[PDB]
């Protein structure tokens, strides 16, 4: 009966003011408003955080963090393994789960209806419906920016010695 609902006002420069009666509806408004302005950005960064850059863009490209696509993918595939996402989700409060559920729904609602007015990547195969796991992937990517994220190339490069002298 209640579901997801949000009221959005935009003031000068396109700043959204989102009103809702709960976290789910709040997330809904945030995801919708953000998609209107930045759907392609989020879709690209989700591809990165899923470790699927080489799959869509090949090995000769880089992420927006200027890591090569294949080493980036190996790193985020390692970072965002299913067990790790599951554990992170399980540890979330109802409020935060609801924020994330709403955000994904609102982003996806914009995507369903978009006709390109503010979205340049319409029709690209990497522009697609997102899930709460994708938002967890982004969160964990930002989480480690002050730690192992700074060693992503170094992690990929780590292999035992052979028989050298």
């Amino acid at each position: 009966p209640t579901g997801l609902a949000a009221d959005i006002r935009w003031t000068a420069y396109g700043v959204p003011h989102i009103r809702a009666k709960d976290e789910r509806g709040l997330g809904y408004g945030i995801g919708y408003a953000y998609a209107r302005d930045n759907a392609c950005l989020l879709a690209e960064e989700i591809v990165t955080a899923r470790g699927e850059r080489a799959r869509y863009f090949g090995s000769e490209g880089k992420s927006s963090a200027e890591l090569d696509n294949l080493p980036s993918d190996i790193f985020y595939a390692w970072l965002n393994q299913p067990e790790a996402l599951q554990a992170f989700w399980q540890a979330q409060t109802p409020a935060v789960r609801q924020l994330l559920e709403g955000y994904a729904a609102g982003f996806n609602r914009f995507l369903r209806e978009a006709d390109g007015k503010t979205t340049s990547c319409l029709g690209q195969p990497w522009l697609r419906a997102i899930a709460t796991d994708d938002l967890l992937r982004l969160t964990r990517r930002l989480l480690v920016e002050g730690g192992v994220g700074q060693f992503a190339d170094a992690l990929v490069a780590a292999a035992p010695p052979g028989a050298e002298k």
Partner: protein, 548 residues
Amino acid sequence: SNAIAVGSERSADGKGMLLANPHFPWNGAMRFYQMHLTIPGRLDVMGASLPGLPVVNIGFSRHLAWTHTVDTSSHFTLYRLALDPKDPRRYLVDGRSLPLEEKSVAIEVRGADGKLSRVEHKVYQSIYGPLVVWPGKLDWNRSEAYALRDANLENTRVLQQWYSINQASDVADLRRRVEALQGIPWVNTLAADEQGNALYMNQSVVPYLKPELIPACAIPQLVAEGLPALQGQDSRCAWSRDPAAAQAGITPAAQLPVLLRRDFVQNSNDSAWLTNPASPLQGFSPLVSQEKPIGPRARYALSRLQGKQPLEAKTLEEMVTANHVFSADQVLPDLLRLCRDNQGEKSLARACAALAQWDRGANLDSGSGFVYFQRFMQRFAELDGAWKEPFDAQRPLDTPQGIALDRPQVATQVRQALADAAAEVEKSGIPDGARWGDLQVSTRGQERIAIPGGDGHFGVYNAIQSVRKGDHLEVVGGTSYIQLVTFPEEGPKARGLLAFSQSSDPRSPHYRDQTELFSRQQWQTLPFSDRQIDADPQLQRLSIREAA
């Protein structure tokens, strides 16, 4: 990132005031986005957030404003492993040989032909975390390897933490909420409230070692070089447990720097030490905060903040919009003296003229002196003992200063550095008469918008980082979300800009509008109350719903 919080004892109105000036990328996964969130009766907060996060990261509410700066604390440790001499895939802990774990990741790769191929790659892991290699420094040979333990990998509290901050009423409340959860990954927090409290917190997620463990568990040569490296062959060098900490192995909130004052607190990415020099923060773990010389941005801020005169909103605003290159205060007077001592040196003529005319700023209209100065400073910074007054721990706000021109060796080397810098600049294709704004730009469609500001390492508070792209310097990061908050009777007054504009999409009406304003350094109101929002002539509204 810069941040300044001002309290009742120094603000012109006797209330709290906060300048937020984070320096972050202009593209990608850390591109700030403005939004205002309201659940009537229990949440009402406005500010900016990072992509994908359903919370406000830097912002304000009815009685409180807060922001963040990247801290100097370590949020991981390296462990040096002692490898089993029989097997480089095994390592020794307490004299016992343990196997590395191997986990393969499978990646799909799109080829030339457009077909997908599968790549399988082994990621080796120790009890501490994954192995890492920096060739020539952190190798994996038959004797040693390095593993990395990231303290935030187990921080499941990070979203909850800003959800909680978003609900904070005042500075005291904010402090309770942060110390309770300890979910902040790697930034300081600075805040001010209407009652006139100014708060600094170095409250983040930091590996914990009990004091008596640190001399024994450190790798001396690596920590001396800035790496948080520990002895991985001793089980006693595991991160220490304290039941008071919100996460096993991290530093409890009571042992992390906090300063609550009514005059001011500031940070520009140095340690907690000189947040406010009248009350230095010392005596913390080296993993947390150390007494190191402060950078020129903080030194600049302190030079404006110290004293007895009231601080106005316009004062804090103009600390950003002045674009003053504070590093020039330290070295340009003596550099100009050197110039005057070397008239007749034809090669130095243009450079010395430019440096002399220069307004010592990174403004759009600042002359070529800025470019000459940058190239010189880059070379100056690699000279040895060229400061007239070296860093002095008892005078950390006023040192280093000046050039040691009375030492013949220094004089010769500095002149050479200027000579070298001059030739480099003149070797570039930059037309005579060019000003800084002609060079540093942000591209929007077919236009290049001139962007004021310059690199933080030269002491420009309005820090802007650029890279060469063809004939120009393209901005990649720096001043981003700007928020300046005061608390007049009617409600919070917030002023600022999102420098790169709301939308990354060229199709958007909000792709370049704030960027043009940033170019002109014209900050704007951030409407927060229903009355402010309704006063907006361009107000748009949409209500949306769908079944769950």
